[PDB]
């Protein structure tokens, strides 16, 4: 149901820069590294295929 | 000469003792007092 | 009948074809052994022991030999460079054909133990049914081992009887084998300390023959034996897989950290000297003597050994490797012929930069130049659209000190750019990737491969330790339980003890 | 070679198969 | 005292409801203060 | 034979609620710092000056993203005792370097010791054979080759799994980008094993509630089992019949297929921890060099092994800066790993 | 069963299976030297690990020349 | 492409060993008498 | 006829203790600000 | 394709048939006890 | 060609796989979830690059 | 010379056969693209 | 049964509640305190939310050294003023 | 530290009132343990 789910979208939980400090810095959580991660893979994923700034699907 | 860790580390096996110790001596302490009953 | 993973089971109440089995296993080890050594010898280049050691050769057996005296040839040559060298009987050669004889011989001896199974030896006096006196056993062997342990110790590694041990500097530069006295103080359980190694062997050998003898002359007590189940020989299969076991993680961790038994020279570098920079650090200092002293900088580079700056290349980290990327490391980016010389890089403004080195992690990795500061000034760009700190836009160079390539400046971009690339795996060196068809990517190193194997043993070991001493303690229900179990041996609260009838 | 050494495993284990099912010991009630 | 006088069926849902209350206490701490984004 | 040690021996193997043993004196203080430990970091404790990063709930965090972290590169493998050379004895200060990290880690390992000879105690006493400390020896050596083994082979401490949902996460990523950990045979037939001991689980559970005999008159059909009764709940010879059919081959002997479940999961787990053995040494299963020598010389040649690699680049060059804070690493936006517009 | 001149020489060597002393015995002796034990390889496990540091003792490649 | 050249009598041997050990066993179990 | 102080009590209580504390803790933090 | 595809759609239909007018011949009935379910 | 931009994937043992890296490769982007059996095609060659084996199976 | 009365006969049934030779067939299967690497 | 009272007896009688009525709201308003009175952030040496940098400084204090990792901490602890 | 105090403060008047309500139960068990 999960893959079924996410199929529409309906993503996993997101915590990126939940956690601020007093003057309003991020304090990244483990979340966050996750997040670095998730962002290698869709930098690189299909390299030559998308020409707009989002990829909607 | 003694180090501060040579003594840190005699500071960790003098309480590790302690603690087996007391662990130990509580525990007998107790077998004695409630005993099984047998025959 | 039996299992196919139960047929050695037949050797249990049978002394004699026991030793047997053991006399056949020793004989296939000591064949290994011999063999082994056969081929490293029929496949190993003496020839240059600075730029082409036997850890790049893939050399196993080898550094066994050396580390405990070991270290010529029969045909003239020695691992240390030198010629002309009579080993005497006890070279390579000879240490593999003994080998090769003794694993005969065991043969033969266990053919003898094989037809011969029955003698009165193994049978019990009053009974007249096979048994093993296991614990006199124990004391019999620990006596043995242990004036083994200590003759080895006080006559072989002293050099009073024997040749002494394979010892070194701090940058494994000038190894080879010496005497060794005992260390006496505290200093002797340091690892890195030799004379420690020694005072191991002559002190836990006399321990050793102390404890022996008292394994002999003194009877188990009742409470232990019964527990122990010290009547079945699989309890002492369980206790000593056992013992094996923290042998092998022992060994397996020695050899990744480095000790005073695993030597640089014998079976390449650490991962920890990469991460520290060990080698550059001792580098970069002899350098700076070197300017202090008034030698030029060509001079001051050019003073460095090729051996000191070879140890200074990721090349030669033993965690840069691959499971199935088998073989030498010459099989991966060469045979190391020599140093090119030191690399400085400089931008248009004449500022010294560096480039940042790969960490043994990443299979690759960008180039990234920053002044002595670490402050960006050039790199490789990916996407070039935005670039800022092109090699072209930053105008680089870079100069060689030191080396083949001495005295040398390149500027042109392409260059310049191979080189920042080289800059990475530390210092640079030429390589002959032809002789082997070497394909240019990254294998472990003897201390690689050993520390593999014995952690990985040491781990299944654990399980044959569990699996041994779970046959031994209950052997009276591993075909089943009681057929006739009461449920009030189970039952809650009916008996006060568990298990314990007389306590209803 | 390479691909004719997976191809004769795959092979071998679907013959397999086949004698598994068709020419197992039968199963019998005692 | 002794076992009973107070019916287990009301145990279970009082106590039940204070997990509920504490849980939506911890979901609200989601959306504001600490660890909200904002 | 009734002195002391057969009088704590009699108190310690009563018939209790919760059985103690002898076994239990290393395993209830050592489970119970290691639980306690997680609870008391999760809740309390930062790993700003270790990572960088909030942790607990004090800070902010919730249950997916609380953990207790490793400790800083620069702690090496430092055993990190409270009284040792590190802290000096400062409990704020150890909590403040990750020494809650190799408490957990400890604890938890004796704690393990404890409980598989939990096991084979209380099978001695009840007389049962010792199957299922056997079979928990699949747990250990997970436990000591990811927790203990695998940072031990690397430079620190640090690089071990943080104890913690999101952390573990981070975990897995790391070991995709850096290690190629899918493409390993060890942590392949980790996953048949475990998938297979799943499966093996459904089928069983499901054809024995669908092949039960009728024992009662009601609808619900729990009630017509007795624990003590001698025959079997369900039909072998049915089950047997159906699956025959139904799939090609079918188990004969309950005796077999109980084992085999024993076999499936436990060796799949064995199998997986010596992978990550070698990914200790960095031994890996990284590549397939015919692959990279063809498609070095062919631009053409694409493959999802080479479409994989790629993704592995992007994890690596995207999550070090702030996953390795140690290394300082500053990667200028121009070299950054990027496909077309994203 | 066979007899041979070296199992004569070796017989009183293997006749005693079985053979125990009463009780406990030497158990208590035997616990103190494991106890020494434990405590040695704590020590030589902490200098390798630098939780144990001692005067002249450097735990480094650079421990002599 | 350019394969390690031992893969094919390691993946042969590595089939056939153990494979023949198992049909050796098997067969003499047949052939016990019934 | 029961007796109050049993293993199963100090179990229990080594458990429940602390579980209380730290539930009135974590629910103070839903409260804080930054 | 246009033969090929002439042939599927044959193929398809003649299976499909065959389960339907299959379910319809009196299935419930196919069963070891109870047959009578009319 | 997977994703629809003319960069063919290679799937197959014969045409440079071994058994890890080998697949039979999803349809064409360009083609979605448009129904394409062997007959939509102008040929097997056209069938093939395209990713009709895929949509078989 | 007088038979060893330890001798134990041996046995390998036609379902162990099938379960060996698809687990070695199988290993095979999958560590072979790591042989030819 | 193992002889320890039943606990459907325990939490169905009016004395357990009589003494828990007050044990467990003590100990969760005593946790509550811990947190709310700061005392948490210095037993753990957790920061508080204007304590993880110093007004300008946007870099880690993360620690480099082993062996004097403690004072190290001391230092960054200064520099928050 | 009068945090201290003000945090352990409503632990040590919860131990000290369960033991009012149970001390004649728990001195009847020991003693009869005795
Ligand atoms: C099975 C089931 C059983 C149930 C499980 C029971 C769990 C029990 C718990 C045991 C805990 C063991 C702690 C090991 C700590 C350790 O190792 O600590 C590491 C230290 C070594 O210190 C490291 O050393 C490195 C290299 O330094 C050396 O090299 C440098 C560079 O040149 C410098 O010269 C430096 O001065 C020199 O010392 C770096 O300094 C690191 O930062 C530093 O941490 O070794 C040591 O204490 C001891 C090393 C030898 C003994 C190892 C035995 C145990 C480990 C076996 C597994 C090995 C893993 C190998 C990978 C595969
Ligand atoms: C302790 C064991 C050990 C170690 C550490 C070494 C180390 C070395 N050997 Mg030596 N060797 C050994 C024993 C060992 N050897 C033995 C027993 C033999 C006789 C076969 C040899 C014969 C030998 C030769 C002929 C050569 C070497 C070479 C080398 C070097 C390259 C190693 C390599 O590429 O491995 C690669 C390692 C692997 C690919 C790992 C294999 C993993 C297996 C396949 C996993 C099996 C999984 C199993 C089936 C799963 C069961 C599942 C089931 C239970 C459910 C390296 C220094 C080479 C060299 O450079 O010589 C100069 C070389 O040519 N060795
Ligand atoms: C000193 C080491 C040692 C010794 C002497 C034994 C001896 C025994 N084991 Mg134990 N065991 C050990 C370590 C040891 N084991 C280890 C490390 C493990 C975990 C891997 C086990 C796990 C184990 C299990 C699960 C079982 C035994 C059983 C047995 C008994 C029957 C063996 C047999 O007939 O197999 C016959 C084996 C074959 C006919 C073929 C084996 C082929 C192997 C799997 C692959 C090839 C091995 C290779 C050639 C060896 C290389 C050497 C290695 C150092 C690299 C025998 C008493 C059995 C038993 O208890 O019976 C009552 C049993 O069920 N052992
Ligand atoms: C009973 C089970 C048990 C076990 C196996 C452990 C094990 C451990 N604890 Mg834990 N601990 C426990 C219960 C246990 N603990 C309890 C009940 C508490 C609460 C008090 C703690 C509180 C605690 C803290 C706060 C810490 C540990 C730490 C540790 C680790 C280091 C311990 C050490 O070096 O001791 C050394 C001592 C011994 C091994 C004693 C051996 C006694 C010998 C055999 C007898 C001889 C003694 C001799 C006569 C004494 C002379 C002294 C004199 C010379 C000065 C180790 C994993 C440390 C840690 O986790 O760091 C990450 C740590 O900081 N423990
Ligand atoms: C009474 C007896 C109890 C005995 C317990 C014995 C010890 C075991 C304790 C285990 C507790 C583990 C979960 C704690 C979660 C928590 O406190 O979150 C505490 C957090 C606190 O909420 C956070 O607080 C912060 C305060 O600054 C911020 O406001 C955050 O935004 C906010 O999310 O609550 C949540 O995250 C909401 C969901 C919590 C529930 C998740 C449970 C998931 C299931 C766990 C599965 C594992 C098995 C457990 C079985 C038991
Ligand atoms: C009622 C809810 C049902 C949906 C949940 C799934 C449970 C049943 C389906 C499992 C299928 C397994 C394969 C067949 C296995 C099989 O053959 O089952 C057989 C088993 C016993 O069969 P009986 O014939 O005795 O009883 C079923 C009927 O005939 C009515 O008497 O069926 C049940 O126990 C039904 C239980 C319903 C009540 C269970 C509620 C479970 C709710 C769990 C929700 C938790 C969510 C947590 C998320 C964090
Ligand atoms: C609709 C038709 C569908 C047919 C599809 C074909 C099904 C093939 C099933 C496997 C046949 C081979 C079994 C050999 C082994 C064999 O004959 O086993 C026979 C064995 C019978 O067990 P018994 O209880 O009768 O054995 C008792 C004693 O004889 C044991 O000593 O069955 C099992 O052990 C069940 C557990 C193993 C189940 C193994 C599943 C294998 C799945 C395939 C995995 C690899 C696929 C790789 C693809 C490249
Ligand atoms: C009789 C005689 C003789 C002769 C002898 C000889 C000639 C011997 C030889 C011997 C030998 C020549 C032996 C050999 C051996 C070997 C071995 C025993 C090996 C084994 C191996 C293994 C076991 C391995 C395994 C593996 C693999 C394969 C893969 C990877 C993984 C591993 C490592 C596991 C003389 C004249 C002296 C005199 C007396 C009589
Ligand atoms: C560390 C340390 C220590 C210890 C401590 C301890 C021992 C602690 C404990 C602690 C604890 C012991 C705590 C507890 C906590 C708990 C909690 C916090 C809980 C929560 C819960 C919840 C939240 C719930 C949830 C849920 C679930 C789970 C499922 C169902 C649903 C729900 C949602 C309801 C010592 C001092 C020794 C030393 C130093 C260090
Ligand atoms: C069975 C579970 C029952 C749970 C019931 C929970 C209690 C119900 C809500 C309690 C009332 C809220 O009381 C709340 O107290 C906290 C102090 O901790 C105050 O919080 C105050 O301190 C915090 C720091 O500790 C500051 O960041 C905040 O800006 C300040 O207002 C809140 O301003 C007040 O609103
Ligand atoms: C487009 C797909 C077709 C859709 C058709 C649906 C329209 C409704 C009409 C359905 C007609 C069903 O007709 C059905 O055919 C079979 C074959 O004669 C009949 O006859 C069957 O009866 C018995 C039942 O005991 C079977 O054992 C026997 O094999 C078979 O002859 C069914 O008793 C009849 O009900
Ligand atoms: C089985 C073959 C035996 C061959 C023996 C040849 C002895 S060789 C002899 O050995 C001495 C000790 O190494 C040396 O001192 C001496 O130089 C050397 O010639
Ligand atoms: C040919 C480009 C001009 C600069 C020289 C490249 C950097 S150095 C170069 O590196 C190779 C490894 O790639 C070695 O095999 C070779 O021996 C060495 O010359
Ligand atoms: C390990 C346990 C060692 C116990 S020591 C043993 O203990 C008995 C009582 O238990 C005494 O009666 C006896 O004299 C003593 O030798
Ligand atoms: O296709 Mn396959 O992956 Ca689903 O997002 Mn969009 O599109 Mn493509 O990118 Mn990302
Ligand atoms: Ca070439
Ligand atoms: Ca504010
Ligand atoms: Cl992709
Ligand atoms: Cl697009
Ligand atoms: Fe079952
Ligand atoms: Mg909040």
């Known amino acids: 149901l999960g893959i079924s789910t996410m199929a529409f979208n309906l993503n996993g939980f997101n915590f990126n820069h939940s956690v601020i400090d007093a003057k309003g810095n991020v304090i990244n959580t483990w979340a966050d590294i996750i997040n670095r991660a998730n962002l290698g893979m869709e930098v690189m994923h299909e390299r030559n295929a998308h020409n707009f700034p989002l990829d909607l699907a | 000469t003694i180090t501060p860790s040579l003594k840190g580390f005699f500071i960790g096996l003098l309480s590790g003792a302690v603690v087996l110790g007391l662990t130990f001596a509580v525990l007998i302490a107790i077998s004695q007092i409630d005993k099984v009953q047998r025959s | 009948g039996l299992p196919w993973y139960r047929v050695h089971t037949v050797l249990i109440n049978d002394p004699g074809r026991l030793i047997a089995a053991h006399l056949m296993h020793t004989a296939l080890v000591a064949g290994w052994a011999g063999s082994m050594a056969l081929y490293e010898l029929a496949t190993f280049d003496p020839s240059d022991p600075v730029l082409n050691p036997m850890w790049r050769q893939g050399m196993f057996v080898l550094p066994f030999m050396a580390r405990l005296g070991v270290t010529g040839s029969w045909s003239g040559w020695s691992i240390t460079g030198e010629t002309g060298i009579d080993p005497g009987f006890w070279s390579f050669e000879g240490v593999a054909l003994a080998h090769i004889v003794l694993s005969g011989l065991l043969f033969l001896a266990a053919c003898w133990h094989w037809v011969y199974w029955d003698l009165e030896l193994f049978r019990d006096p009053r009974t007249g049914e096979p048994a093993l006196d296991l614990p006199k056993m124990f004391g019999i062997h620990l006596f043995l081992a242990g004036l083994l342990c200590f003759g080895f110790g006080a006559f072989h590694l002293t050099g009073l009887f024997g040749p ?95 000790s005073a038994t695993t030597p640089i020279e014998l079976f390449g570098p650490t991962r920890y000297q990469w991460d520290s920079s060990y080698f550059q650090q001792e580098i970069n200092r002899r350098v700076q003597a070197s300017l202090a002293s008034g030698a030029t900088l060509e001079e001051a580079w050019s003073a460095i050994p090729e051996k000191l700056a070879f140890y200074d290349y990721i090349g030669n980290n033993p965690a840069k490797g691959g499971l199935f990327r088998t073989g030498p490391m010459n099989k991966g980016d060469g045979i190391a012929q020599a140093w090119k010389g030191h690399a400085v890089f400089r931008n248009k403004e004449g500022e010294e930069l560096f480039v940042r080195r790969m960490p043994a992690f990443f299979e690759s990795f960008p180039v990234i130049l920053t002044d002595k500061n670490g402050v960006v000034k050039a790199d490789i760009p990916f996407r070039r659209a935005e670039s800022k700190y092109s090699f072209e836009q930053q105008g680089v160079t870079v100069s060689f000190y030191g080396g083949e390539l001495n005295g040398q400046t390149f500027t042109d971009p392409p260059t310049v750019k191979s080189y920042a690339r080289k800059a990475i795996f530390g210092e640079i060196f030429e390589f002959d990737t032809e002789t082997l068809n070497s394909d240019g990517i990254f294998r472990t190193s003897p201390r690689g491969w050993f520390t593999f194997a014995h952690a990985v043993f040491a781990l299944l070991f654990f399980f044959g330790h569990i699996w041994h001493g779970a046959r031994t303690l209950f052997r009276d229900v591993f075909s089943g339980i009681d057929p006739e179990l009461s449920p009030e041996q189970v039952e809650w609260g009916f008996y006060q003890k568990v298990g314990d009838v007389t306590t209803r | 070679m390479e691909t004719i050494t997976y191809v004769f495993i795959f092979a071998c284990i679907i013959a397999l198969f ?13 | 005292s002794e076992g009973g006088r107070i019916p287990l069926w009301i145990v279970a849902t009082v106590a ?13 701490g989601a959306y504001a203060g600490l660890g909200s984004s904002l | 034979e009734r002195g002391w040690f057969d009088i704590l021996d009699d108190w310690l193997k009563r018939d209790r609620f919760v059985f103690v043993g002898w076994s239990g004196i290393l395993l209830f203080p050592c489970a119970y710092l290691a639980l306690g430990g997680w609870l008391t970091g999760t809740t309390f404790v930062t790993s700003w000056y270790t990572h960088g990063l909030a942790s607990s709930y004090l800070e902010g965090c919730n249950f997916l993203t609380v953990a207790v972290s490793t400790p800083a590169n620069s702690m090496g493998h430092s055993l990190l005792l409270l009284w040792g050379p590190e802290a000096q004895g400062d409990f704020t200060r150890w909590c403040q370097l990750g020494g809650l990290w190799t408490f957990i880690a400890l604890h938890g390992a004796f704690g393990l010791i404890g409980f598989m000879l939990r096991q084979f105690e209380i099978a001695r006493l009840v007389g049962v054979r010792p199957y299922n400390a056997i079979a928990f020896s699949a747990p250990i050596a997970v436990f ?70 009728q024992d009662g008159e009601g609808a619900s059909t729990f009630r017509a089992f007795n624990p003590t009764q001698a025959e079997e709940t369900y039909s072998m010879v049915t089950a047997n019949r159906f699956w025959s059919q139904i799939f090609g081959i079918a188990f004969s002997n309950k005796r077999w297929l109980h084992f085999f479940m024993l076999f499936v999961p436990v060796t799949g787990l064995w199998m997986s921890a010596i992978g990550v053995v070698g990914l200790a040494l960095n031994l890996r299963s990284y590549d397939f060099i015919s692959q990279e020598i063809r498609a070095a010389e062919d631009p053409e040649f694409e493959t999802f092994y080479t479409k994989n690699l790629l993704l592995n680049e992007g994890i690596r060059a995207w999550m070090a800066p702030q996953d390795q804070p140690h290394e300082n690493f500053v990667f200028p936006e121009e070299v950054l790993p990027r496909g077309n517009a994203l | ?46 200098i390798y690990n630098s939780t144990l540091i001692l005067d002249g003792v450097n735990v480094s490649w650079k421990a002599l020349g | 492409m350019e394969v390690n050249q031992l893969g094919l009598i390691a993946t042969a041997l590595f089939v056939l060993v153990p494979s023949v050990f198992l049909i050796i066993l098997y067969v003499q179990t047949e052939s016990q008498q019934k | 006829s029961y007796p109050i102080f049993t293993v199963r009590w100090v179990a229990v209580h080594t458990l429940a203790v602390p579980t209380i504390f730290f539930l009135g803790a974590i629910a103070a933090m839903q409260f804080i600000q930054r | 394709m246009e033969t090929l595809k002439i042939t599927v759609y044959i193929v398809v239909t003649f299976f499909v048939l065959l389960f339907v007018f299959g379910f319809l011949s009196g299935d419930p009935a196919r069963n070891p006890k109870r047959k009578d379910l009319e | 060609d997977i994703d629809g931009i003319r960069e063919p994937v290679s799937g197959s043992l014969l045409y440079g796989n071994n058994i890890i890296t080998g697949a039979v490769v999803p349809s064409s982007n360009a083609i979605g979830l448009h129904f394409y059996p062997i007959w939509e095609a102008a040929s097997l060659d056209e069938w093939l690059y395209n990713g009709g084996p895929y949509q078989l199976i | 010379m007088e038979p060893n009365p330890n001798r134990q006969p041996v046995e390998l049934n036609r379902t162990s056969l099938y379960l060996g030779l698809l687990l070695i067939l199988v290993l095979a299967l999958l560590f072979s693209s790591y042989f030819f690497n | 049964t193992t002889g320890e009272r039943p ?75 | 530290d009068w945090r201290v105090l003000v945090v352990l403060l409503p632990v040590l008047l919860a131990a000290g009132w369960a033991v009012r309500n149970i001390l004649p139960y728990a001195v009847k068990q020991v003693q009869k343990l005795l």
């Open chain 4, 18 to 30: 086949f004698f598994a099912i068709f020419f197992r010991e039968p199963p019998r009630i005692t």
């Open chain 6, 144 to 213: 000591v080759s990811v927790f203990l083994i695998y940072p031990l082979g690397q430079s620190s401490w640090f690089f071990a799994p943080s104890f913690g949902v999101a952390a573990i996460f981070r975990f897995l990523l790391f070991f995709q980008g850096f290690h190629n950990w899918t493409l390993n045979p060890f942590h392949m037939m980790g996953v048949a094993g475990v998938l297979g001991g799943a499966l093996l689980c459904a089928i069983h559970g499901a054809t024995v509630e669908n092949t039960l005999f």
């Open chain 7, 1 to 46: 069963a066979r007899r041979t001149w070296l199992g004569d020489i070796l017989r009183p060597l293997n006749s005693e299976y079985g053979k125990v002393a009463p009780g406990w015995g030497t158990t208590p002796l035997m616990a103190v030297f494991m106890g020494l034990f434990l405590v040695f390889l704590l020590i030589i496990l902490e």
């Open chain 5, 16 to 28: 039940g409801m204070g997990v509920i209350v504490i849980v939506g206490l911890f979901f609200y």
């Open chain 13, 7 to 81: 606990f459907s007896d325990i939490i169905t009688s009016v004395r357990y509640w009589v003494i828990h009525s007050i044990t467990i709201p003590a100990l969760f308003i005593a946790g509550w305190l811990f947190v709310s009175t700061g005392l948490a952030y210095d037993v753990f040496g957790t920061p508080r939310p204007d304590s993880y940098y110093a007004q300008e400084q946007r870099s880690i204090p993360l620690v480099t050294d082993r062996f004097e990792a403690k004072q190290q901490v001391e230092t960054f602890l200064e520099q928050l003023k």
């Open chain 3, 164 to 258: 002494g041990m394979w010892v070194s500097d701090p940058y494994g530069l000038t190894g080879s084998v010496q005497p060794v006295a005992p260390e006496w103080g505290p200093d002797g359980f340091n690892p890195y300390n030799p004379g420690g190694v020694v005072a191991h062997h002559i002190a836990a050998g006399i321990v050793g023959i102390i404890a022996g003898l008292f394994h002999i002359l003194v009877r188990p007590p009742q409470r232990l034996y019964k527990a122990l189940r010290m009547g079945n020989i699989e309890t002492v299969l369980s206790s000593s897989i056992a013992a094996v076991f923290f042998a092998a993680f022992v060994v397996a961790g020695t050899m990744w950290y480095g």
